[PDB]
Design an enzyme around this catalytic site. Sequence first.
Site, PDB file in Angstrom:
ATOM      1  N   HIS A  52       0.763  -1.251   0.000  1.00  0.00           N
ATOM      2  CA  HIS A  52       0.000   0.000   0.000  1.00  0.00           C
ATOM      3  C   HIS A  52       0.786   1.289   0.000  1.00  0.00           C
ATOM      4  CE1 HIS A  52      -4.541   1.121   0.792  1.00  0.00           C
ATOM      5  NE2 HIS A  52      -4.056   1.676  -0.337  1.00  0.00           N
ATOM      6  N   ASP A  59     -10.101  -0.154   3.825  1.00  0.00           N
ATOM      7  CA  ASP A  59      -8.959  -0.676   4.544  1.00  0.00           C
ATOM      8  C   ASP A  59      -9.273  -0.979   6.001  1.00  0.00           C
ATOM      9  OD1 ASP A  59      -6.236  -1.101   5.579  1.00  0.00           O
ATOM     10  OD2 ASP A  59      -5.514   0.156   3.956  1.00  0.00           O
ATOM     11  N   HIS A 118      -6.909  -0.497   8.130  1.00  0.00           N
ATOM     12  CA  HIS A 118      -5.967   0.481   8.734  1.00  0.00           C
ATOM     13  C   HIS A 118      -6.115   1.878   8.140  1.00  0.00           C
ATOM     14  CE1 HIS A 118      -4.293  -3.651   8.469  1.00  0.00           C
ATOM     15  NE2 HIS A 118      -4.178  -3.477   9.790  1.00  0.00           N
ATOM     16  N   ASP A 151      -3.564   3.805   7.676  1.00  0.00           N
ATOM     17  CA  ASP A 151      -2.299   4.019   6.949  1.00  0.00           C
ATOM     18  C   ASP A 151      -1.841   5.474   7.017  1.00  0.00           C
ATOM     19  OD1 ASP A 151      -2.793   1.714   4.105  1.00  0.00           O
ATOM     20  OD2 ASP A 151      -2.783   1.395   6.286  1.00  0.00           O
ATOM     21  N   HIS A 187       4.050   1.106   4.105  1.00  0.00           N
ATOM     22  CA  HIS A 187       2.663   0.848   3.680  1.00  0.00           C
ATOM     23  C   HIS A 187       1.686   1.231   4.792  1.00  0.00           C
ATOM     24  CE1 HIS A 187       1.679  -3.456   5.374  1.00  0.00           C
ATOM     25  NE2 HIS A 187       2.499  -2.783   6.218  1.00  0.00           N
ATOM     26  N   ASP A 234      -7.464  -1.560  -0.182  1.00  0.00           N
ATOM     27  CA  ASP A 234      -6.572  -2.529   0.445  1.00  0.00           C
ATOM     28  C   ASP A 234      -7.402  -3.754   0.638  1.00  0.00           C
ATOM     29  OD1 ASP A 234      -4.955  -4.134   2.201  1.00  0.00           O
ATOM     30  OD2 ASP A 234      -4.433  -2.357   3.398  1.00  0.00           O
ATOM     31  N   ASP A 263      -7.107  -6.106   2.580  1.00  0.00           N
ATOM     32  CA  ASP A 263      -7.312  -6.463   4.012  1.00  0.00           C
ATOM     33  C   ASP A 263      -8.497  -5.698   4.646  1.00  0.00           C
ATOM     34  OD1 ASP A 263      -6.557  -3.998   5.257  1.00  0.00           O
ATOM     35  OD2 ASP A 263      -4.438  -4.573   5.322  1.00  0.00           O
ATOM     36  N   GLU A 314      -2.228  -5.053  -1.757  1.00  0.00           N
ATOM     37  CA  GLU A 314      -1.893  -5.990  -0.695  1.00  0.00           C
ATOM     38  C   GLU A 314      -2.220  -7.491  -0.910  1.00  0.00           C
ATOM     39  OE1 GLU A 314       0.153  -5.343   1.655  1.00  0.00           O
ATOM     40  OE2 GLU A 314       0.116  -3.143   1.882  1.00  0.00           O
TER      41      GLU A 314
HETATM   42  N1  1EC Z   1      -0.284   0.391  11.774  1.00  0.00           N
HETATM   43  C1  1EC Z   1       0.571  -0.727  11.410  1.00  0.00           C
HETATM   44  C2  1EC Z   1       0.752  -1.622  12.626  1.00  0.00           C
HETATM   45  C3  1EC Z   1       1.322  -0.853  13.810  1.00  0.00           C
HETATM   46  C4  1EC Z   1       1.675  -1.772  14.972  1.00  0.00           C
HETATM   47  O1  1EC Z   1       2.041  -0.961  16.106  1.00  0.00           O
HETATM   48  C5  1EC Z   1      -0.066  -1.587  10.316  1.00  0.00           C
HETATM   49  C6  1EC Z   1      -0.049  -0.935   8.928  1.00  0.00           C
HETATM   50  C7  1EC Z   1      -0.741  -1.764   7.831  1.00  0.00           C
HETATM   51  C8  1EC Z   1      -0.520  -1.140   6.435  1.00  0.00           C
HETATM   52  B1  1EC Z   1      -1.672  -1.390   5.366  1.00  0.00           B
HETATM   53  O2  1EC Z   1      -1.432  -1.052   3.915  1.00  0.00           O
HETATM   54  O3  1EC Z   1      -1.720  -2.894   5.248  1.00  0.00           O
HETATM   55  O4  1EC Z   1      -3.088  -1.055   5.675  1.00  0.00           O
HETATM   56  C9  1EC Z   1       1.894  -0.116  10.919  1.00  0.00           C
HETATM   57  O5  1EC Z   1       2.822  -0.867  10.542  1.00  0.00           O
HETATM   58  O6  1EC Z   1       2.037   1.139  10.865  1.00  0.00           O
HETATM   59 MN    MN Z   2      -3.521  -0.308   3.573  1.00  0.00          MN
HETATM   60 MN    MN Z   3      -4.600  -2.579   5.704  1.00  0.00          MN
END
Ligand code: 1EC
Ligand code: MN
Ligand code: MN
Lengths: 314, 314, 314
Positions: free
Chosen positions: A97, A120, A122, A124, A137, A228, A230, A273
């Site tokens: 991502h 998503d 998240h 992000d 990402h 995304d 996910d 993803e």
């Molecule tokens: N927020 C996460 C986890 C943080 C753990 O403290 C996950 C980010 C996921 C990225 B995606 O593109 O998959 O939504 C990060 O890596 O920043």
């Molecule tokens: Mn994402």
């Molecule tokens: Mn995600």
Amino acid sequence: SRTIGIIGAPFSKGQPRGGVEEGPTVLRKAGLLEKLKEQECDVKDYGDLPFADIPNDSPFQIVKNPRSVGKASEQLAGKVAEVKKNGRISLVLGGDHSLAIGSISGHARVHPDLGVIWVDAHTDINTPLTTTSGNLHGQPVSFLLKELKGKIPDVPGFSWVTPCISAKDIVYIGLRDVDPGEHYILKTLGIKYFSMTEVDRLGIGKVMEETLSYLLGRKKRPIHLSFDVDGLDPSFTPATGTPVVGGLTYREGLYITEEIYKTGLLSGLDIMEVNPSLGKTPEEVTRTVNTAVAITLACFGLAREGNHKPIDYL
Amino acid sequence: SRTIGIIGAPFSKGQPRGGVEEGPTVLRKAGLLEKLKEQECDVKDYGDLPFADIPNDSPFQIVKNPRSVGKASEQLAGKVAEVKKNGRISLVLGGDHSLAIGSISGHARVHPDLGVIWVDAHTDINTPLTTTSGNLHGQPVSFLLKELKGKIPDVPGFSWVTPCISAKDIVYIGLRDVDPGEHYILKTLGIKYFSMTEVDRLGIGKVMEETLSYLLGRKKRPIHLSFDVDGLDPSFTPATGTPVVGGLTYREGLYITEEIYKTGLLSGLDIMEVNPSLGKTPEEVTRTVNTAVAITLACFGLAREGNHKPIDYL
Amino acid sequence: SRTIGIIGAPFSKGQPRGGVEEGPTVLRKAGLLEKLKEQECDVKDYGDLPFADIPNDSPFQIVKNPRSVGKASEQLAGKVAEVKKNGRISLVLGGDHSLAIGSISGHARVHPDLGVIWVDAHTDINTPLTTTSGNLHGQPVSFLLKELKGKIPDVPGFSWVTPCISAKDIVYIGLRDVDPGEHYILKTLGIKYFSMTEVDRLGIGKVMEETLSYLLGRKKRPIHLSFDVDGLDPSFTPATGTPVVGGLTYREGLYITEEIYKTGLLSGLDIMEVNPSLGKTPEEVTRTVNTAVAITLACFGLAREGNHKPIDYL
Ligand SMILES: N[C@@](CCCO)(CCCC[B-](O)(O)O)C(=O)O
Ligand SMILES: [Mn+2]
Ligand SMILES: [Mn+2]
Ligand SMILES: N[C@@](CCCO)(CCCC[B-](O)(O)O)C(=O)O
Ligand SMILES: N[C@@](CCCO)(CCCC[B-](O)(O)O)C(=O)O
Ligand SMILES: [Mn+2]
Ligand SMILES: [Mn+2]
Ligand SMILES: [Mn+2]
Ligand SMILES: [Mn+2]
């Protein structure tokens, strides 16, 4: 009629697991381009982008692979803007991502009034300073937002970036795993979001009505949808890096995209993803790629009630 | 009080896979008749219909097994009208969906003002001329509709047929796999439908309110419910010929039937397309037959909130 | 700020299967107390209650293990009221559902104006006289209701009991397996309920709005939430004694508890019927305990949209 430009972005360095770079291959082999042509669609494949290795790429503070991520987005931005200039809907197959930085950036070069819908689990939206993982990402939105200019340090590989969207120009759908700092930003900037809590409260029908009203009430404008995979529950898209239970259903995924398609303002699309290597079985892979393809076809006209050509069938 | 007439229709020639002819046996062995008697219900079994083989049955143009399908529906129509004349709710266990031609036809002989609710992933409204598969379980609605008289060629085995319902008299719930020609007819005749798109938009509560209002607003009338088990998601009813992901939930299936039961106007019921041979495992078979039975019991009074006899339990 | 008192209730004699007595151990080992501390929460563990064996405990008429069940609830009631007197939210880990007699009883000693929300597939409202199973985890509500005083015989082990809630003070969410006698009581006393039928009709958003309005419209009051994990579909909580298909989703479970948490009136909580021994696989166990933990964390502030501390993260 929707015209399409397909862009392959086989890139994984916005996060640790390598297999996501294959996403474009497996989506393509699933017959994506063919099924698109099967429907209304004029398709032009711009190929898979070739990302040179950047072997000297040590962390910036805790941010990982910054030059590789930044260059990959720069190159992608160029190819998106080119596709947009060719009057085509851009379809980016990821790829992790972090590439949204380039996809949204290049899109905005041709359409600075774009509104973003972000599907998503998240937000992000970590900055290089709030991130705990260092995975880019998890950071693309922070770089894109004007309001955070002042908060993003100078990260190697990213000096070409200029934030192209305001907090008012993006709606999130699906959130269920938001970092505290992300939540602080989310609340401070007053970003429109529908977490799984809102989807549960309102139902996906009202979520899409509020989403589209919020982005297009004032004025019609091009829509960029960054999907995304996910965002959907891992029972539909398991083959992915950061799965989270309690996700959107398959049906909801198709309703979101059905509704967007019907605006006739879809302008940019990211399908992100898909990590075929992360399927615990070959059926989990197929289920994932199949869902991804179906989401995409809906985005370009394929409706559950059916479709027909403008002829008399009887 | 609901009185019931059970009709077994062990017939498969409306489509390629043979195992659906066993549906009546497996539903019966699952204890159907017993569980019905366990509740409010007076049950009369009219037995399984005996369908002579018609070994000379070459395609009509591309339509497959036309005489076998047509005769099987003719015989069924006779037995439905007989059950209806006996003042019983007809319960047809299929058997492939082509049998609806007979079920609805015989029902309409005693109740020409019937309204149809059709629960299914498909519109089953292809004509012999628009079909690409030639499979008749994909065509029953075309034969039944008055508006299409002029469009159905003379197919051997079907000269006994007289279309008994108008476009206004049927509501579809569940659609998610509609052929282009079917969609053309659907839109041209202005048929009321709730595809999975509508169910997603509105929620099943509003779907059933609009469905029942639409059919009964004007006048109370008998209801015929033709339930294709592929209307539910294959996670609940996998053992079936033409499964389609993104289906109705178990809960939605029970809510649809709960609501119909409560009208007190259920007059005819078809429980169709259970193919035990198509379960990839013995548990998939049981899950399918179990769901089918549960849908049926709800249709005759079994409610999730509970039921009790008119006595003082304390 | 929410302060918490954790009470382990390793007890199984309200029903036949033994494994539910381990629920407290497996929830604890899943990191419950730690994750609570990870969030806003001040946690005090009052330990697992020690329930002496009562080896002479023959049925009372058909009611099984009456003294063992009754004493276990008596002891629990004492420990709840103690926790409540310490100004803490009581968190009971079961243990079978018969323990609600003690949990609700002890809670009501400190807060006689409590309202109960009961999340469950069952109404657990059989009396010793209407029960067919004799299992007391199917009877706790009958003992607690003032309106049924006159209908509960003198059962050994239960003379300490005094019904502390009226029919108006409890809302059920989730019902889908209600005995006829239970349904008679349900309808006779006019208890507020949302069976899966209502959840399907209204959507969980409106269910929680009506639930909270109904209990708190008149006056704010402490809330006791008795969560039977079989209230959720067995696809999320399979490791349990009396699973019933067509249950609440994971999402709905989290929305119910999210909404309750947000009242700021959660006062007592029971997390009941986790039977790790009943998982057909080790993954089914983990899925069950994981869901149970997640429901609990939501009850104490963990929100899907995210959470952050009152600092500036940027
Ligand atoms: N927020 C996460 C986890 C943080 C753990 O403290 C996950 C980010 C996921 C990225 B995606 O593109 O998959 O939504 C990060 O890596 O920043
Ligand atoms: Mn994402
Ligand atoms: Mn995600
Ligand atoms: N529409 C189908 C598929 C067409 C492929 O081009 C499917 C019909 C399914 C019949 B059912 O009773 O199962 O709903 C047909 O055979 O007509
Ligand atoms: N109502 C049941 C079944 C009756 C069969 O006739 C089930 C009670 C389940 C108790 B629980 O705590 O799990 O909800 C009972 O044992 O009373
Ligand atoms: Mn069908
Ligand atoms: Mn059908
Ligand atoms: Mn229960
Ligand atoms: Mn219970």
